[PDB]
Amino acid sequence: XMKXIEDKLXEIXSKXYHXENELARIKXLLX
Amino acid sequence: XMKXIEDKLXEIXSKXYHXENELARIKXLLX
Amino acid sequence: XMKXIEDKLXEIXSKXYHXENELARIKXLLX
Amino acid sequence: XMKXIEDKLXEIXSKXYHXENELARIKXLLX
């Protein structure tokens, strides 16, 4: 349950690293 | 309630696939 | 509390619309 | 716990600012 929820919000705070870094990839190609 | 919350965090962990893949679309056009 | 949490996950499921649509802006300029 | 969860959903509603603003960076370079 709660600890499922918090350790999904683990995955988001990874996807929101790979968000920033793979934007900063693109802004590389264009900058 | 809890199970609403966890199965929204389902939708985010979809939107955060369609995040990655439609960035990786763009980085296609530019790469 | 819970209902704070679920109606933040309202805001994310908006930001994750404005995510998709303002990527699909960019993929317009490049497509 | 709950207050961990809500103040992670603080960090997301930051990452989802730095989302918007560093897309609007890119859409600068291209607009």
Short mmCIF file of N, CA and C in Angstrom, two decimals:
data_model
loop_
_atom_site.label_atom_id
_atom_site.label_comp_id
_atom_site.label_asym_id
_atom_site.label_seq_id
_atom_site.Cartn_x
_atom_site.Cartn_y
_atom_site.Cartn_z
N UNK A 1 1.30 -2.18 0.00
CA UNK A 1 0.00 0.00 0.00
C UNK A 1 0.78 1.31 0.00
N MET A 2 0.90 1.88 1.18
CA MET A 2 1.61 3.13 1.38
C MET A 2 3.07 3.13 0.93
N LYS A 3 3.78 2.09 1.32
CA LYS A 3 5.22 1.97 1.12
C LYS A 3 5.60 1.73 -0.32
N UNK A 4 4.89 0.83 -0.94
CA UNK A 4 3.83 0.68 -3.17
C UNK A 4 3.75 2.12 -3.63
N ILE A 5 2.93 2.91 -2.99
CA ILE A 5 2.78 4.32 -3.36
C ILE A 5 4.11 5.11 -3.31
N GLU A 6 4.80 5.07 -2.17
CA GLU A 6 5.94 5.96 -1.97
C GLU A 6 7.15 5.51 -2.78
N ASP A 7 7.41 4.22 -2.78
CA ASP A 7 8.53 3.67 -3.51
C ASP A 7 7.70 3.53 -5.83
N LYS A 8 6.42 3.78 -6.11
CA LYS A 8 6.05 4.55 -7.30
C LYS A 8 6.48 6.00 -7.36
N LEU A 9 6.35 6.75 -6.26
CA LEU A 9 6.74 8.16 -6.34
C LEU A 9 8.27 8.31 -6.44
N UNK A 10 9.01 7.45 -5.78
CA UNK A 10 11.11 6.30 -6.47
C UNK A 10 11.16 6.29 -7.98
N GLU A 11 10.19 5.64 -8.60
CA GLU A 11 10.12 5.55 -10.04
C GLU A 11 9.90 6.88 -10.73
N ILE A 12 9.02 7.71 -10.18
CA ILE A 12 8.76 9.00 -10.82
C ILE A 12 9.93 9.96 -10.59
N UNK A 13 10.33 10.11 -9.36
CA UNK A 13 11.43 11.00 -9.03
C UNK A 13 13.38 9.91 -10.29
N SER A 14 13.37 8.65 -10.65
CA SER A 14 13.97 8.17 -11.91
C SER A 14 13.52 8.72 -13.27
N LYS A 15 12.21 8.68 -13.54
CA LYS A 15 11.67 9.13 -14.83
C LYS A 15 11.71 10.62 -15.00
N UNK A 16 11.53 11.32 -13.90
CA UNK A 16 11.54 12.76 -13.88
C UNK A 16 13.96 13.37 -13.77
N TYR A 17 14.79 12.45 -13.35
CA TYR A 17 16.09 12.29 -13.91
C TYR A 17 16.16 12.05 -15.43
N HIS A 18 15.59 10.95 -15.91
CA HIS A 18 15.78 10.54 -17.31
C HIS A 18 15.08 11.47 -18.28
N UNK A 19 13.83 11.78 -18.00
CA UNK A 19 12.79 13.99 -18.11
C UNK A 19 13.90 15.00 -18.31
N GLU A 20 14.51 15.39 -17.22
CA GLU A 20 15.59 16.37 -17.24
C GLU A 20 16.74 16.07 -18.17
N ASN A 21 17.29 14.88 -18.10
CA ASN A 21 18.56 14.67 -18.72
C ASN A 21 18.45 14.35 -20.21
N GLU A 22 17.49 13.50 -20.59
CA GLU A 22 17.31 13.13 -21.99
C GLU A 22 16.07 15.16 -22.89
N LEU A 23 15.52 16.06 -22.12
CA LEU A 23 15.53 17.49 -22.44
C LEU A 23 16.90 18.14 -22.59
N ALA A 24 17.81 17.87 -21.67
CA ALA A 24 19.12 18.55 -21.70
C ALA A 24 20.04 18.04 -22.79
N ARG A 25 20.10 16.72 -22.94
CA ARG A 25 20.08 15.43 -25.00
C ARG A 25 19.67 16.41 -26.10
N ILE A 26 18.39 16.73 -26.09
CA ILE A 26 17.81 17.64 -27.05
C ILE A 26 18.38 19.06 -27.03
N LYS A 27 18.40 19.72 -25.88
CA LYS A 27 18.81 21.12 -25.86
C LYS A 27 20.29 21.26 -26.27
N UNK A 28 21.12 20.38 -25.76
CA UNK A 28 22.95 19.19 -26.90
C UNK A 28 22.79 19.37 -28.40
N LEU A 29 21.82 18.69 -28.96
CA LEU A 29 21.56 18.77 -30.39
C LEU A 29 21.22 20.16 -30.95
N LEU A 30 20.48 20.97 -30.20
CA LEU A 30 20.04 22.27 -30.74
C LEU A 30 20.99 23.44 -30.41
N UNK A 31 21.77 23.26 -29.38
CA UNK A 31 22.28 24.76 -27.56
C UNK A 31 23.04 26.02 -27.18
N UNK B 1 -11.05 4.82 -3.42
CA UNK B 1 -9.14 5.97 -2.22
C UNK B 1 -7.72 5.57 -2.57
N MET B 2 -7.16 4.72 -1.74
CA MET B 2 -5.81 4.22 -1.90
C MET B 2 -5.54 3.50 -3.23
N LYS B 3 -6.45 2.61 -3.58
CA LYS B 3 -6.30 1.73 -4.73
C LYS B 3 -6.43 2.44 -6.06
N UNK B 4 -7.43 3.28 -6.14
CA UNK B 4 -7.71 5.58 -7.02
C UNK B 4 -6.30 6.11 -7.09
N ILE B 5 -5.68 6.33 -5.95
CA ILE B 5 -4.31 6.84 -5.91
C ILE B 5 -3.31 5.97 -6.68
N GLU B 6 -3.24 4.68 -6.35
CA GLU B 6 -2.17 3.83 -6.87
C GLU B 6 -2.38 3.50 -8.34
N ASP B 7 -3.60 3.17 -8.70
CA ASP B 7 -3.93 2.83 -10.07
C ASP B 7 -4.15 5.03 -11.16
N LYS B 8 -4.13 6.16 -10.45
CA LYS B 8 -3.42 7.33 -10.93
C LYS B 8 -1.91 7.24 -11.06
N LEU B 9 -1.22 6.64 -10.09
CA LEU B 9 0.24 6.57 -10.21
C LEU B 9 0.67 5.59 -11.32
N UNK B 10 -0.07 4.51 -11.47
CA UNK B 10 -0.81 3.39 -13.57
C UNK B 10 -0.77 4.41 -14.68
N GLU B 11 -1.57 5.46 -14.55
CA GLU B 11 -1.64 6.51 -15.55
C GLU B 11 -0.35 7.29 -15.69
N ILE B 12 0.29 7.61 -14.58
CA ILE B 12 1.53 8.39 -14.67
C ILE B 12 2.68 7.51 -15.18
N UNK B 13 2.88 6.38 -14.55
CA UNK B 13 3.94 5.47 -14.95
C UNK B 13 3.24 4.86 -17.35
N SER B 14 2.01 4.99 -17.77
CA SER B 14 1.67 5.40 -19.15
C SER B 14 2.17 6.73 -19.73
N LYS B 15 1.90 7.84 -19.03
CA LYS B 15 2.27 9.18 -19.51
C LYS B 15 3.75 9.43 -19.45
N UNK B 16 4.38 8.86 -18.44
CA UNK B 16 5.80 9.00 -18.23
C UNK B 16 6.83 7.28 -19.73
N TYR B 17 6.06 6.30 -20.13
CA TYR B 17 6.15 5.76 -21.45
C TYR B 17 5.96 6.75 -22.61
N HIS B 18 4.79 7.37 -22.72
CA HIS B 18 4.46 8.18 -23.90
C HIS B 18 5.27 9.45 -23.98
N UNK B 19 5.35 10.17 -22.87
CA UNK B 19 7.34 11.22 -21.92
C UNK B 19 8.53 10.69 -22.68
N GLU B 20 9.00 9.54 -22.27
CA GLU B 20 10.15 8.90 -22.90
C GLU B 20 10.09 8.72 -24.39
N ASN B 21 9.01 8.14 -24.88
CA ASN B 21 9.05 7.66 -26.24
C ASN B 21 8.75 8.75 -27.27
N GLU B 22 7.75 9.60 -27.00
CA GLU B 22 7.39 10.67 -27.92
C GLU B 22 9.19 12.40 -27.42
N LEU B 23 9.96 12.34 -26.36
CA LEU B 23 11.37 12.71 -26.40
C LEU B 23 12.26 11.93 -27.35
N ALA B 24 12.14 10.61 -27.37
CA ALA B 24 13.03 9.79 -28.19
C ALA B 24 12.72 9.85 -29.67
N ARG B 25 11.44 9.77 -30.00
CA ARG B 25 10.22 11.09 -31.64
C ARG B 25 11.13 12.26 -32.00
N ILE B 26 11.22 13.18 -31.07
CA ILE B 26 12.03 14.37 -31.22
C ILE B 26 13.53 14.10 -31.40
N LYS B 27 14.17 13.36 -30.50
CA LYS B 27 15.61 13.21 -30.57
C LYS B 27 16.02 12.47 -31.86
N UNK B 28 15.29 11.43 -32.19
CA UNK B 28 14.47 10.81 -34.43
C UNK B 28 14.66 12.00 -35.37
N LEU B 29 13.83 13.00 -35.19
CA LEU B 29 13.90 14.20 -36.02
C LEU B 29 15.21 14.98 -35.98
N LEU B 30 15.86 15.06 -34.83
CA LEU B 30 17.08 15.90 -34.72
C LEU B 30 18.39 15.13 -34.98
N UNK B 31 18.33 13.83 -34.81
CA UNK B 31 19.85 12.36 -33.66
C UNK B 31 21.21 11.70 -33.73
N UNK C 1 -6.29 16.68 3.62
CA UNK C 1 -4.84 14.62 3.33
C UNK C 1 -4.98 13.82 2.04
N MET C 2 -5.73 12.75 2.14
CA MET C 2 -5.98 11.85 1.02
C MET C 2 -6.60 12.52 -0.21
N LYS C 3 -7.63 13.31 0.03
CA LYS C 3 -8.45 13.91 -1.01
C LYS C 3 -7.73 15.02 -1.76
N UNK C 4 -7.09 15.87 -1.01
CA UNK C 4 -4.86 16.94 -1.12
C UNK C 4 -4.08 16.05 -2.07
N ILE C 5 -3.78 14.84 -1.65
CA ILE C 5 -3.03 13.91 -2.49
C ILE C 5 -3.70 13.64 -3.86
N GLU C 6 -4.96 13.22 -3.85
CA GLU C 6 -5.59 12.74 -5.07
C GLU C 6 -5.92 13.89 -6.02
N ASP C 7 -6.45 14.96 -5.49
CA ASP C 7 -6.81 16.11 -6.28
C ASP C 7 -4.66 17.28 -6.60
N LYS C 8 -3.56 16.89 -5.95
CA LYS C 8 -2.27 16.85 -6.61
C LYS C 8 -2.09 15.88 -7.76
N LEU C 9 -2.58 14.64 -7.63
CA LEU C 9 -2.38 13.69 -8.73
C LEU C 9 -3.25 14.06 -9.94
N UNK C 10 -4.44 14.57 -9.70
CA UNK C 10 -5.62 16.44 -10.85
C UNK C 10 -4.59 17.31 -11.52
N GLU C 11 -3.70 17.89 -10.73
CA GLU C 11 -2.65 18.75 -11.24
C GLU C 11 -1.65 18.04 -12.12
N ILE C 12 -1.25 16.84 -11.72
CA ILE C 12 -0.26 16.11 -12.53
C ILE C 12 -0.90 15.57 -13.81
N UNK C 13 -2.00 14.86 -13.65
CA UNK C 13 -2.69 14.29 -14.79
C UNK C 13 -3.36 16.40 -16.11
N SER C 14 -3.45 17.58 -15.55
CA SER C 14 -3.07 18.83 -16.23
C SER C 14 -1.65 19.03 -16.81
N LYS C 15 -0.63 18.86 -15.96
CA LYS C 15 0.76 19.08 -16.37
C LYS C 15 1.27 18.02 -17.31
N UNK C 16 0.80 16.81 -17.11
CA UNK C 16 1.18 15.67 -17.91
C UNK C 16 -0.28 15.81 -19.93
N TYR C 17 -1.37 16.53 -19.83
CA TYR C 17 -1.86 17.33 -20.91
C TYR C 17 -0.89 18.39 -21.46
N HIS C 18 -0.49 19.36 -20.65
CA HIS C 18 0.27 20.51 -21.14
C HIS C 18 1.67 20.13 -21.58
N UNK C 19 2.37 19.38 -20.74
CA UNK C 19 3.73 17.43 -21.28
C UNK C 19 3.45 17.07 -22.72
N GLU C 20 2.39 16.32 -22.91
CA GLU C 20 1.98 15.88 -24.24
C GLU C 20 1.82 16.95 -25.29
N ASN C 21 1.08 17.99 -24.98
CA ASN C 21 0.64 18.86 -26.03
C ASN C 21 1.68 19.91 -26.41
N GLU C 22 2.34 20.52 -25.41
CA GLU C 22 3.35 21.54 -25.66
C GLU C 22 5.35 20.11 -26.30
N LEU C 23 5.41 18.83 -26.09
CA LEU C 23 6.03 17.89 -27.03
C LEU C 23 5.44 17.85 -28.44
N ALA C 24 4.12 17.81 -28.54
CA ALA C 24 3.49 17.66 -29.86
C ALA C 24 3.53 18.92 -30.70
N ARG C 25 3.23 20.05 -30.06
CA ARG C 25 4.35 22.21 -30.20
C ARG C 25 5.67 21.95 -30.92
N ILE C 26 6.57 21.33 -30.19
CA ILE C 26 7.89 21.00 -30.69
C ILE C 26 7.90 20.04 -31.89
N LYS C 27 7.26 18.88 -31.78
CA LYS C 27 7.37 17.89 -32.85
C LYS C 27 6.75 18.43 -34.15
N UNK C 28 5.60 19.07 -34.03
CA UNK C 28 4.91 21.14 -35.15
C UNK C 28 6.12 21.80 -35.78
N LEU C 29 6.96 22.37 -34.94
CA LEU C 29 8.17 23.03 -35.41
C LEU C 29 9.17 22.17 -36.18
N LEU C 30 9.35 20.91 -35.79
CA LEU C 30 10.38 20.07 -36.43
C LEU C 30 9.86 19.25 -37.62
N UNK C 31 8.57 19.03 -37.65
CA UNK C 31 7.37 16.99 -38.08
C UNK C 31 6.96 16.00 -39.16
N UNK D 1 6.06 9.69 7.05
CA UNK D 1 4.30 8.65 5.55
C UNK D 1 3.52 9.56 4.62
N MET D 2 2.33 9.91 5.05
CA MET D 2 1.43 10.77 4.30
C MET D 2 2.01 12.15 3.95
N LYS D 3 2.59 12.78 4.94
CA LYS D 3 3.07 14.16 4.84
C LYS D 3 4.30 14.30 3.97
N UNK D 4 5.23 13.42 4.19
CA UNK D 4 6.69 12.04 2.72
C UNK D 4 5.97 12.06 1.39
N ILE D 5 4.83 11.43 1.31
CA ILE D 5 4.06 11.39 0.06
C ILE D 5 3.71 12.78 -0.49
N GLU D 6 3.08 13.62 0.33
CA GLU D 6 2.52 14.87 -0.18
C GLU D 6 3.61 15.89 -0.47
N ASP D 7 4.56 16.01 0.43
CA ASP D 7 5.65 16.95 0.28
C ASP D 7 7.19 15.78 -1.26
N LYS D 8 6.98 14.51 -1.61
CA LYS D 8 7.20 14.07 -2.98
C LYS D 8 6.29 14.64 -4.05
N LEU D 9 4.99 14.75 -3.80
CA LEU D 9 4.11 15.28 -4.85
C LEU D 9 4.35 16.78 -5.07
N UNK D 10 4.63 17.51 -4.01
CA UNK D 10 6.29 19.35 -3.75
C UNK D 10 7.35 19.19 -4.81
N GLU D 11 8.06 18.07 -4.78
CA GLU D 11 9.10 17.79 -5.74
C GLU D 11 8.60 17.62 -7.15
N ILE D 12 7.48 16.93 -7.32
CA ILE D 12 6.97 16.72 -8.67
C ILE D 12 6.35 18.01 -9.22
N UNK D 13 5.46 18.59 -8.46
CA UNK D 13 4.80 19.82 -8.87
C UNK D 13 6.79 21.45 -9.05
N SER D 14 7.92 21.25 -8.42
CA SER D 14 9.23 21.60 -8.99
C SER D 14 9.70 21.03 -10.35
N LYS D 15 9.68 19.70 -10.47
CA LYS D 15 10.16 19.02 -11.70
C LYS D 15 9.23 19.21 -12.86
N UNK D 16 7.95 19.26 -12.57
CA UNK D 16 6.92 19.43 -13.56
C UNK D 16 6.85 21.90 -13.97
N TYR D 17 7.36 22.67 -13.05
CA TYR D 17 8.08 23.86 -13.37
C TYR D 17 9.31 23.68 -14.28
N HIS D 18 10.31 22.93 -13.84
CA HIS D 18 11.59 22.88 -14.55
C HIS D 18 11.48 22.16 -15.87
N UNK D 19 10.85 20.99 -15.86
CA UNK D 19 9.19 20.20 -17.47
C UNK D 19 8.81 21.37 -18.35
N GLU D 20 7.89 22.17 -17.86
CA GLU D 20 7.42 23.34 -18.59
C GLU D 20 8.47 24.30 -19.07
N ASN D 21 9.35 24.73 -18.19
CA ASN D 21 10.16 25.87 -18.52
C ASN D 21 11.39 25.51 -19.35
N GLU D 22 12.08 24.42 -19.00
CA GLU D 22 13.27 24.00 -19.74
C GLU D 22 12.24 22.88 -21.77
N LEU D 23 10.97 22.55 -21.84
CA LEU D 23 10.19 22.67 -23.07
C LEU D 23 10.08 24.07 -23.67
N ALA D 24 9.80 25.06 -22.85
CA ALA D 24 9.58 26.42 -23.38
C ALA D 24 10.85 27.11 -23.82
N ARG D 25 11.89 27.00 -23.00
CA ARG D 25 14.21 26.55 -23.56
C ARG D 25 14.21 26.10 -25.02
N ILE D 26 13.74 24.88 -25.21
CA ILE D 26 13.66 24.27 -26.51
C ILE D 26 12.75 25.00 -27.51
N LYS D 27 11.50 25.25 -27.16
CA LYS D 27 10.57 25.81 -28.14
C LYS D 27 11.02 27.22 -28.56
N UNK D 28 11.44 28.02 -27.59
CA UNK D 28 13.38 29.52 -27.62
C UNK D 28 14.26 29.17 -28.81
N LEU D 29 14.95 28.06 -28.71
CA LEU D 29 15.83 27.61 -29.78
C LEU D 29 15.18 27.35 -31.14
N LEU D 30 13.96 26.82 -31.16
CA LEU D 30 13.33 26.45 -32.45
C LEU D 30 12.46 27.56 -33.05
N UNK D 31 12.01 28.46 -32.21
CA UNK D 31 9.80 29.38 -31.99
C UNK D 31 8.79 30.32 -32.62
#
